[PDB]
Design a protein around this ligand. Structure first.
Ligand SMILES: *[C@@H]1O[C@H](CO)[C@@H](O[C@@H]2O[C@H](CO)[C@@H](O)[C@H](O)[C@H]2NC(C)=O)[C@H](O)[C@H]1NC(C)=O
Ligand SMILES: *[C@@H]1O[C@H](CO)[C@@H](O[C@@H]2O[C@H](CO)[C@@H](O)[C@H](O)[C@H]2NC(C)=O)[C@H](O)[C@H]1NC(C)=O
Ligand SMILES: [Cu+2]
Ligand SMILES: [Cu+2]
Ligand SMILES: [Cu+2]
Ligand SMILES: [Cu+2]
Ligand code: NA
Length: 499
């Protein structure tokens, strides 16, 4: 069952064995992935998060981010530790009380403390639209049509060297999959369809690192949503999905009744499908209960290419149709050396006082804010352009901006910008050497918004900056509840920190 929009959510430690290997984890709702949180567009969500964690090897503090939800007027509820809050300590709870005006689509939630979401705190978050313009394109859209793609590690996250190339031990599809080494024939996930029906498959990358080449043997996929943004219909036979991205696609159950492999090939870790790694099963009602015998093609003839995507609505692009054609045009210098990432010459290390609390206490320019050199102010009611030229080791890096979606004016592997009708999204691959992936948005949401690579190991190694958007209006726009004001005193007391 789905939970929400008003619900408790308990965060616990437990042993799980999603690939046949038992390890302890950090779980929401007792499962991996966590339960789906859901509601309708414009609803009030009140997710009371109970921190019941006791195992220090995965951190007993926590904080949860609602990925892709804009949090307008509720920056304090966004979740990134030391940007918008101090962590919740064990034995305490916190009500994330916010609204989702003007958004409908496929989202997710995850820990946003250190690398803790890798240890298991990740689940889907769906905001349905009762008047969805795409409703007539499918018959079925429910908890059974959500497909999560996850990397899973046998080593606990707090034992991963910072700045290292860290590699997973299994791909999990809907929480199940097989290990790359010492492979055992543990259970595979089954997605069940009825011949003749059309399904809104909600594909969610809950990855901490790899991108996946996703396909379904014998089937194609008609994209209708990208990171929350309705798209024109685009039919493809493969989707390369980077960490934290989402797509809705229509699956037409139009092939013979049978069993078909669902494939998710990561860019690192196990390559191929030997022993049923990187796999799940599409089963038609009436098919025999047995593994598929289908083949992938050698090459995919209609792969997703990001510049082929266009919004369903006339979203356009803000600003002027050339590089630098914005009120505030920025170019970030994105680098890696010696185990640490940097942006504009500064490696991100979380501050002691959350950025939002520094601003509410009266710090009102970006040079007064800590960490020094990690906070860039943005002016209000202005068109922002951010060029993100690739080259830093460990790519391709999927950059994500909180508080906003953005027009993708230039995509990976294509030097031509689009100032007319690019897709809008919230997490974008910045590509390869020589690329110049560029995003645009307008500043109508006061508060400090994190910008970072969504490979969680890279964020931990410093690949982040904070956009302090409209510092002068942050306090009036974001009134804070007493429970939020209580978080830093409690956290600092528990950890013997003075501030
Ligand atoms: C990516 O595009 C940005 C512009 O959006 C380029 O920025 C210019 O960089 C040159 C120096 O390299 C400066 O003289 C300009 O002031 C910058 N802004 C402009 C021209 O609008 C950046 O060089 C591009 N990077 C790559 C790798 O192609
Ligand atoms: C590279 O990106 C450009 C810009 O998004 C793509 O160019 C568009 O191509 C479409 C489809 O043919 C045309 O309708 C548009 O007028 C083009 N826009 C511009 C600004 O040129 C281009 O197709 C992409 N290249 C590849 C190989 O997909
Ligand atoms: Cu996220
Ligand atoms: Cu986010
Ligand atoms: Cu990265
Ligand atoms: Cu973030
Ligand atoms: Na425009």
């Amino acid at each position: 069952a789905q939970i929400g929009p008003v619900t408790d959510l308990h965060i616990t430690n437990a042993n799980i064995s999603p690939d046949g290997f038992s390890r302890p984890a950090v779980l929401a709702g007792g499962t991996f992935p966590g339960p789906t949180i859901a509601g309708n567009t414009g609803d009030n969500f009140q997710i009371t998060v109970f921190n019941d964690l006791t195992d220090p090897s995965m951190l007993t503090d926590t904080s949860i981010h609602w990925h892709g939800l804009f949090q307008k007027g509720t920056n304090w509820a966004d979740g990134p530790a030391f940007v918008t809050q101090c962590p919740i300590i064990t034995g305490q709870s916190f009500d994330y009380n916010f609204n989702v005006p003007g958004q409908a689509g496929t989202f997710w939630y995850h820990s946003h403390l250190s690398t803790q979401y890798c240890d298991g705190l990740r689940g889907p978050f769906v905001v349905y639209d009762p008047n969805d313009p795409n409703a007539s394109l499918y018959d079925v859209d429910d908890d059974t049509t959500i497909i999560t793609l996850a990397d899973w590690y046998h080593t606990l996250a707090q034992q991963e060297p910072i700045g290292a190339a860290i590699t997973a031990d299994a791909t999990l599809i809907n929480g199940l999959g097989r290990s790359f080494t010492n492979t055992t024939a543990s259970p595979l996930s089954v997605i069940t369809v009825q011949s003749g029906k059309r399904y809104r498959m909600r594909l969610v990358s809950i990855s901490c690192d790899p991108n996946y080449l996703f396909s379904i043997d014998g089937h194609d996929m008609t994209i209708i949503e990208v990171d929350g943004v309705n798209s024109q219909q685009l039919t493809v036979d493969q989707i390369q999905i980077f960490a934290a991205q989402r797509y809705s696609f229509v699956l037409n159950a139009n092939q013979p009744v049978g069993n078909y492999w669902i494939r998710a090939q990561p860019n690192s870790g196990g390559q191929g499908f030997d022993g049923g790694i990187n796999s799940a099963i599409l089963r038609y009602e009436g098919a025999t209960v047995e593994d598929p015998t289908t083949t992938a093609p050698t090459t995919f003839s209609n792969p997703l290419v990001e510049t082929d995507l266009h919004p369903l609505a006339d979203l356009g692009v803000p600003g002027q149709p050339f590089r630098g054609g914005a009120d505030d045009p920025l170019v970030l210098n994105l680098a890696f050396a010696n185990g640490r990432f940097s942006i504009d010459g500064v490696s991100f290390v979380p501050p002691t006082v959350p950025v939002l609390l520094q601003i509410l206490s009266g710090a009102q320019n970006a040079q007064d804010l800590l960490p020094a050199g990690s906070v860039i102010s943005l002016p209000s009611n202005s068109v922002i352009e951010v060029a993100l030229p690739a080259g830093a080791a460990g790519g391709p890096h999927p950059f994500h901006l909180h508080g906003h979606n953005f027009a993708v004016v230039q995509s990976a592997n294509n030097a031509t910008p689009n100032y007319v009708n690019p897709i809008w999204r919230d997490t974008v691959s910045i590509g390869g050497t020589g690329d110049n992936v560029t995003i645009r948005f307008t500043t109508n949401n006061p508060g400090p918004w994190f910008l970072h690579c969504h490979i969680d190991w890279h964020l931990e190694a410093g690949f982040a900056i904070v956009f302090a958007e409209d510092i002068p209006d942050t306090a009036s726009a974001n009134p804070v509840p007493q429970a939020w004001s209580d978080l830093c005193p409690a956290y600092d007391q528990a950890h013997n920190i003075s501030t």
